[PDB]
Design an enzyme around this catalytic site. Structure first.
Site, PDB file in Angstrom:
ATOM      1  N   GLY A  18       0.796  -1.218   0.000  1.00  3.32           N
ATOM      2  CA  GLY A  18       0.000   0.000   0.000  1.00  3.32           C
ATOM      3  C   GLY A  18       0.827   1.265   0.000  1.00  3.32           C
ATOM      4  CB  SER A  19       1.445   3.819  -1.738  1.00  5.56           C
ATOM      5  OG  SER A  19       0.554   3.456  -2.780  1.00  5.56           O
ATOM      6  N   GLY A  20       0.295   5.971   0.064  1.00  8.66           N
ATOM      7  CA  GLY A  20      -0.477   7.156   0.397  1.00  8.66           C
ATOM      8  C   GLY A  20       0.424   8.310   0.801  1.00  8.66           C
ATOM      9  N   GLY A  21       0.196   9.484   0.234  1.00  6.78           N
ATOM     10  CA  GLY A  21       1.045  10.606   0.595  1.00  6.78           C
ATOM     11  C   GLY A  21       2.488  10.278   0.264  1.00  6.78           C
ATOM     12  CB  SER A  22       5.610  11.354   1.492  1.00  2.38           C
ATOM     13  OG  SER A  22       6.131  11.117   2.786  1.00  2.38           O
ATOM     14  CE  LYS A  24       7.572   4.417  -2.418  1.00  8.78           C
ATOM     15  NZ  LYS A  24       9.080   4.509  -2.499  1.00  8.78           N
ATOM     16  CB  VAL A  25       2.266  -0.533   3.761  1.00  8.93           C
ATOM     17  CG1 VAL A  25       2.423  -1.520   4.899  1.00  8.93           C
ATOM     18  CG2 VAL A  25       1.619   0.739   4.238  1.00  8.93           C
ATOM     19  CE  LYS A  39       2.071   4.952   7.361  1.00  8.72           C
ATOM     20  NZ  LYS A  39       0.904   5.433   8.170  1.00  8.72           N
ATOM     21  CG  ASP A 133     -12.568   8.798   7.494  1.00 12.75           C
ATOM     22  OD1 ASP A 133     -13.668   9.014   6.939  1.00 12.75           O
ATOM     23  OD2 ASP A 133     -11.558   8.416   6.867  1.00 12.75           O
TER      24      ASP A 133
HETATM   25  C1  LIG Z   1      -0.571  -9.091   2.657  1.00 15.43           C
HETATM   26  O1  LIG Z   1      -0.797  -8.008   3.512  1.00 15.43           O
HETATM   27  C2  LIG Z   1      -1.854  -7.191   3.143  1.00 15.43           C
HETATM   28  C3  LIG Z   1      -2.404  -7.225   1.885  1.00 15.43           C
HETATM   29  C4  LIG Z   1      -3.469  -6.397   1.579  1.00 15.43           C
HETATM   30  N1  LIG Z   1      -4.041  -6.477   0.247  1.00 15.43           N
HETATM   31  C5  LIG Z   1      -5.013  -5.392  -0.384  1.00 15.43           C
HETATM   32  C6  LIG Z   1      -5.664  -5.989  -1.447  1.00 15.43           C
HETATM   33  C7  LIG Z   1      -4.718  -7.089  -1.942  1.00 15.43           C
HETATM   34  C8  LIG Z   1      -3.867  -7.496  -0.660  1.00 15.43           C
HETATM   35  O2  LIG Z   1      -3.210  -8.489  -0.547  1.00 15.43           O
HETATM   36  C9  LIG Z   1      -3.988  -5.519   2.539  1.00 15.43           C
HETATM   37  C10 LIG Z   1      -3.425  -5.492   3.808  1.00 15.43           C
HETATM   38  C11 LIG Z   1      -2.346  -6.334   4.093  1.00 15.43           C
HETATM   39  N2  LIG Z   1      -1.669  -6.417   5.378  1.00 15.43           N
HETATM   40  C12 LIG Z   1      -1.229  -5.230   6.059  1.00 15.43           C
HETATM   41  N3  LIG Z   1      -1.409  -4.089   5.468  1.00 15.43           N
HETATM   42  C13 LIG Z   1      -1.055  -2.930   6.008  1.00 15.43           C
HETATM   43  N4  LIG Z   1      -1.300  -1.740   5.231  1.00 15.43           N
HETATM   44  C14 LIG Z   1      -2.142  -1.948   4.072  1.00 15.43           C
HETATM   45  C15 LIG Z   1      -3.115  -0.808   3.834  1.00 15.43           C
HETATM   46  C16 LIG Z   1      -4.050  -0.612   5.103  1.00 15.43           C
HETATM   47  C17 LIG Z   1      -5.160  -0.003   4.605  1.00 15.43           C
HETATM   48  C18 LIG Z   1      -5.426  -0.772   3.164  1.00 15.43           C
HETATM   49  C19 LIG Z   1      -4.186  -1.102   2.677  1.00 15.43           C
HETATM   50  C20 LIG Z   1      -0.447  -2.929   7.270  1.00 15.43           C
HETATM   51  C21 LIG Z   1       0.060  -1.960   8.151  1.00 15.43           C
HETATM   52  C22 LIG Z   1       0.092  -0.462   7.915  1.00 15.43           C
HETATM   53  N5  LIG Z   1       0.116   0.648   7.735  1.00 15.43           N
HETATM   54  C23 LIG Z   1       0.533  -2.632   9.270  1.00 15.43           C
HETATM   55  N6  LIG Z   1       0.326  -3.940   9.085  1.00 15.43           N
HETATM   56  C24 LIG Z   1      -0.266  -4.158   7.872  1.00 15.43           C
HETATM   57  N7  LIG Z   1      -0.673  -5.297   7.237  1.00 15.43           N
END
Ligand SMILES: COc1cc(N2CCCC2=O)ccc1Nc1nc(NCC2CCCC2)c2c(C#N)c[nH]c2n1
EC number: 2.7.12.1
Length: 265
Positions: A18-22, A24-25, A39, A133
């Site tokens: 994931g990503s947003g602003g500046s 990345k995850v 992150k 939110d």
């Molecule tokens: C394989 O891990 C993942 C995969 C997917 N997705 C999305 C669709 C396809 C897929 O596989 C989503 C989530 C995870 N796990 C995960 N995400 C994170 N941030 C993802 C953002 C949070 C809001 C939507 C995205 C954090 C995070 C932070 N900050 C601290 N632990 C985290 N753990």
């Protein structure tokens, strides 16, 4: 693949979640092949306000996880004037992506997911945070539980390969002119609704001024199809009351039969 050291430890990058602003995850692996999220936030250009929101996230994250394992955990972090690295509990997927795959929900897992959400939101309330939110994307599925991730201060991340209004409480829309824990109850209700009726309350009003209006309209009644679990029906009904003073509170929700009596009636 690229790697990342954090406070003297190396992690390899499976993929970018994931990503947003500046920021990345990344889904990463450590030395011993265990899996983590990291992150990264590039502070290079970052106003003193955005900078202080990231600082605030880290502090509250570090305090809140002591009091609930339904809050996504932060294990280690590096912060400089240049960057932030946060090593965190990695979710399987976020609840909004899981919901979008239209697989319908085992009632007992819905009820257990609901407990998870309440516990998490309840403990952020007990430290003075009203998220404001709340949406499915704030919850991640791990160890078969839902865990809260973004306290709605630092800007929310988006998944990699818009965002909605469907969970916006009425008080927030009436407030735009010239803050209550009840607001999170409304958004938590919209999530529950979605988990029980396949759709958020006004997810049919595709038009967004049209949608916005319904939310604040005392005479646009929300439908509540009858269901086997009647306690569940009653939870959704008190969660989605537009007068926040009549809306049910978290501490009440925690005493409510849906949550307290294990056989779903
Ligand atoms: C394989 O891990 C993942 C995969 C997917 N997705 C999305 C669709 C396809 C897929 O596989 C989503 C989530 C995870 N796990 C995960 N995400 C994170 N941030 C993802 C953002 C949070 C809001 C939507 C995205 C954090 C995070 C932070 N900050 C601290 N632990 C985290 N753990």
């Amino acid at each position: 693949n690229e790697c990342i050291s954090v406070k003297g430890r190396i992690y390899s990058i499976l993929k970018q979640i994931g990503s947003g602003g500046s920021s990345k995850v990344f889904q990463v692996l450590n030395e011993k092949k265990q899996i983590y999220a990291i992150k990264y936030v590039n502070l290079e250009e970052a106003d003193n306000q955005t900078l202080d929101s990231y600082r605030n996230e880290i502090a509250y994250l570090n305090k809140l996880q002591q009091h609930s394992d339904k809050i996504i955990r932060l294990y280690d972090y590096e912060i400089t004037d240049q960057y932030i690295y946060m090593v965190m509990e990695c979710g399987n997927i976020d609840l909004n992506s899981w919901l979008k795959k239209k697989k319908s929900i085992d009632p007992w897992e819905r009820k257990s997911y609901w407990k998870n959400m309440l516990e998490a939101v309840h403990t952020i309330h007990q430290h003075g945070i009203v998220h404001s939110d709340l949406k499915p994307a704030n919850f991640l599925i791990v160890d078969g539980m839902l865990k809260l991730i973004d306290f709605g201060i630092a800007n929310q991340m988006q998944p990699d390969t818009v965002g909605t209004v469907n969970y916006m409480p009425p008080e927030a829309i009436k407030d735009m002119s010239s803050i209550s824990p009840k607001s999170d109850v409304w958004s938590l209700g919209c999530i529950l609704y979605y988990m029980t009726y396949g759709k958020t309350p006004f997810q049919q009003i595709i038009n967004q001024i049209s949608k916005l209006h319904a939310i604040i309209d005392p005479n646009h009644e929300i439908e509540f199809p009858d269901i086997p679990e009647k306690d569940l029906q009653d939870v959704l009904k008190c969660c989605l009351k537009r007068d926040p003073k009549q809306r049910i509170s978290i501490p009440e929700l925690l005493a409510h039969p849906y949550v307290q009596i294990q056989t779903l009636e």
